[PDB]
Ligand binder design. Structure first.
Ligand SMILES: *[C@@H]1O[C@H](CO)[C@@H](O)[C@H](O)[C@H]1NC(C)=O
Ligand SMILES: [Cu+2]
Length: 227
């Protein structure tokens, strides 16, 4: 359980969607982060993978603001303290807005995977995962925006999937957090994109899985990494 509290880009903080404050406020502030109704700081499980909730989390609506990123620049997402128990991958996707991200229909967004990190080491099951790298980095994740994609406005869909309950059907916990970016530079790729509702299925091999046993491999869920 947790959420993104802050985003660091080009030497300043863009405050996150503080899901334990702003939903209680009813004239809340404009941010680059999408609003959600996930006030339990919880997740979308496999029962919601083919619902709109999977795209940018429960009840999500676009952020009003968009942050510019330098070419091949970094976006650092800072989480609330991530529990060690919530082992799993950290996955990052972009979807083009083809216009102002604040007015996009989230149900039409077509994501391409720009980064993935999974099972890092399994010397002591359940092992050390991307989520443990995030904890070791004091609960932050650095995303590098590719230089090879067409610049424009994009949604960054940044996600932890916790697998501590994933041996049961619909036990995997997805924590997607979306922010609006203005990608800059000289690139031209328009990568093949996947609808939010086709990212994950509740029987995927990296989703329905017992992490407590020795694992020989881990198949990071979602569509193929773009390079
Ligand atoms: C996180 O930062 C705090 C001090 O701000 C430190 O006490 C903690 O040990 C840090 N680093 C890691 C790897 O957890
Ligand atoms: Cu939790």
């Amino acid at each position: 359980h947790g959420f993104v509290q802050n985003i660091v880009i080009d030497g300043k903080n863009y405050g996150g969607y503080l899901v334990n404050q702003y939903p209680y406020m009813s004239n809340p502030p404009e941010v680059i982060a999408w609003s959600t109704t996930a006030t339990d700081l919880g997740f979308v499980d496999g029962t919601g993978y083919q619902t709109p909730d999977i795209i940018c989390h429960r009840g999500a609506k676009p952020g009003a603001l968009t942050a510019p990123v330098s070419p091949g620049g970094t976006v650092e997402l800072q989480w609330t303290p991530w529990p060690d128990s919530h082992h799993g991958p950290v996955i990052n996707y972009l979807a083009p807005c083809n216009g102002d991200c604040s007015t996009v229909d989230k149900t039409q967004l077509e994501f391409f995977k720009i980064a993935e990190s999974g099972l890092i080491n399994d010397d002591n099951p359940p092992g050390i995962w991307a989520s443990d790298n995030l904890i070791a980095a004091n609960n932050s994740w650095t995303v590098t925006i590719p230089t090879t994609i067409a610049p424009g406005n994009y949604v960054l869909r940044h996600e932890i999937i916790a697998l501590h309950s994933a041996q049961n059907q619909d036990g995997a916990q997805n924590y997607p957090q979306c922010i609006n970016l203005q990608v800059t530079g000289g690139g031209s790729d328009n990568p093949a994109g996947t609808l939010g509702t086709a990212l994950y299925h509740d029987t995927d091999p990296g989703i329905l899985i017992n992490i407590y046993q020795k694992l020989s491999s881990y198949i990071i869920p979602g569509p193929p990494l773009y390079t």
